Design a protein around this motif. Sequence first.
Motif, mmCIF file in Angstrom:
data_model
loop_
_atom_site.group_PDB
_atom_site.id
_atom_site.type_symbol
_atom_site.label_atom_id
_atom_site.label_comp_id
_atom_site.label_asym_id
_atom_site.label_seq_id
_atom_site.Cartn_x
_atom_site.Cartn_y
_atom_site.Cartn_z
ATOM 1 N N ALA A 23 1.000 -1.061 -0.128
ATOM 2 C CA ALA A 23 0.042 0.000 0.206
ATOM 3 C C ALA A 23 0.771 1.182 0.051
ATOM 4 O O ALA A 23 0.538 2.210 -0.581
ATOM 5 N N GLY A 24 1.956 1.336 0.843
ATOM 6 C CA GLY A 24 3.005 2.324 0.582
ATOM 7 C C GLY A 24 3.373 2.760 -0.515
ATOM 8 O O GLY A 24 3.539 4.082 -0.783
ATOM 9 N N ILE A 25 3.356 1.680 -1.350
ATOM 10 C CA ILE A 25 3.784 2.167 -2.718
ATOM 11 C C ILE A 25 2.967 3.060 -3.585
ATOM 12 O O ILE A 25 3.177 3.854 -4.160
ATOM 13 N N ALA A 26 1.655 2.562 -3.573
ATOM 14 C CA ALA A 26 0.611 3.409 -4.159
ATOM 15 C C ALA A 26 0.426 4.784 -3.614
ATOM 16 O O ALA A 26 0.438 5.835 -4.418
ATOM 17 N N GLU A 27 0.482 5.021 -2.212
ATOM 18 C CA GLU A 27 0.386 6.383 -1.852
ATOM 19 C C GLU A 27 1.703 7.306 -2.416
ATOM 20 O O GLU A 27 1.470 8.406 -2.531
ATOM 21 N N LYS A 28 2.787 6.430 -2.798
ATOM 22 C CA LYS A 28 3.953 7.097 -3.102
ATOM 23 C C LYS A 28 3.532 7.620 -4.531
ATOM 24 O O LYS A 28 3.956 8.771 -4.882
ATOM 25 N N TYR A 29 2.588 6.938 -5.334
ATOM 26 C CA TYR A 29 2.123 7.169 -6.675
ATOM 27 C C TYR A 29 1.239 8.241 -6.513
ATOM 28 O O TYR A 29 1.024 9.168 -7.411
ATOM 29 N N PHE A 30 0.301 8.193 -5.627
ATOM 30 C CA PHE A 30 -0.805 8.760 -5.471
ATOM 31 C C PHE A 30 -0.416 10.357 -5.146
ATOM 32 O O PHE A 30 -0.919 11.297 -5.699
ATOM 33 N N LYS A 31 0.641 10.289 -4.139
ATOM 34 C CA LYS A 31 1.229 11.715 -3.869
ATOM 35 C C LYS A 31 2.328 11.861 -5.023
ATOM 36 O O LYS A 31 2.503 13.175 -5.011
ATOM 37 N N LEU A 32 2.718 10.923 -5.762
ATOM 38 C CA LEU A 32 3.395 11.345 -7.077
ATOM 39 C C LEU A 32 2.729 12.360 -7.940
ATOM 40 O O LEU A 32 3.192 13.383 -8.533
ATOM 41 N N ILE A 33 1.547 11.871 -7.990
ATOM 42 C CA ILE A 33 0.687 12.651 -9.095
ATOM 43 C C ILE A 33 -0.246 13.916 -8.250
ATOM 44 O O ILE A 33 -0.277 14.763 -8.858
ATOM 45 N N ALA A 34 -0.497 13.479 -7.206
ATOM 46 C CA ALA A 34 -1.264 14.180 -6.343
ATOM 47 C C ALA A 34 -0.334 15.779 -6.355
ATOM 48 O O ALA A 34 -0.951 16.854 -5.832
ATOM 49 N N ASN A 35 1.169 15.586 -5.988
ATOM 50 C CA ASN A 35 1.956 16.586 -5.968
ATOM 51 C C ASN A 35 2.103 17.421 -7.381
ATOM 52 O O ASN A 35 2.264 18.658 -7.622
ATOM 53 N N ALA A 36 2.299 16.521 -8.327
ATOM 54 C CA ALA A 36 2.263 16.872 -9.571
ATOM 55 C C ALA A 36 1.353 17.628 -10.155
ATOM 56 O O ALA A 36 1.236 18.722 -10.881
ATOM 57 N N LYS A 37 0.048 17.134 -9.940
ATOM 58 C CA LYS A 37 -1.332 17.699 -10.375
ATOM 59 C C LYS A 37 -1.825 18.506 -9.363
ATOM 60 O O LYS A 37 -2.087 19.798 -9.567
ATOM 61 N N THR A 38 -1.935 17.933 -8.112
ATOM 62 C CA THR A 38 -2.499 18.595 -7.117
ATOM 63 C C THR A 38 -1.447 19.607 -6.457
ATOM 64 O O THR A 38 -0.249 19.699 -6.950
ATOM 65 N N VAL A 39 -1.862 20.068 -5.211
ATOM 66 C CA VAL A 39 -1.005 21.017 -4.312
ATOM 67 C C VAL A 39 -0.748 20.534 -2.916
ATOM 68 O O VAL A 39 0.295 20.112 -2.440
ATOM 69 N N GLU A 40 -1.950 20.258 -2.028
ATOM 70 C CA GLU A 40 -1.988 19.680 -0.995
ATOM 71 C C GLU A 40 -3.473 19.887 -0.338
ATOM 72 O O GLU A 40 -4.255 20.629 -0.526
#
Length: 56
Positions: A23-40
């Motif tokens: 699961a920790g791997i997904a959050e890393k990607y989720f946060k990978l795009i969430a940071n690239a697309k979103t902000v916080e």
Amino acid sequence: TTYKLILNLKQAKEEAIKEAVDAGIAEKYFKLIANAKTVEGVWTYKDEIKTFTVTE
């Protein structure tokens, strides 16, 4: 497992998916795009169906 992400900011909603037992791997990607697309925002994840969600 096939994870699912949903990013919320105001109106438009973004999606993301990651297949992996770590699961920790997904959050890393989720946060990978969430940071690239979103902000916080408020990060949350569901175990019942393995799904990450953020709210701004």
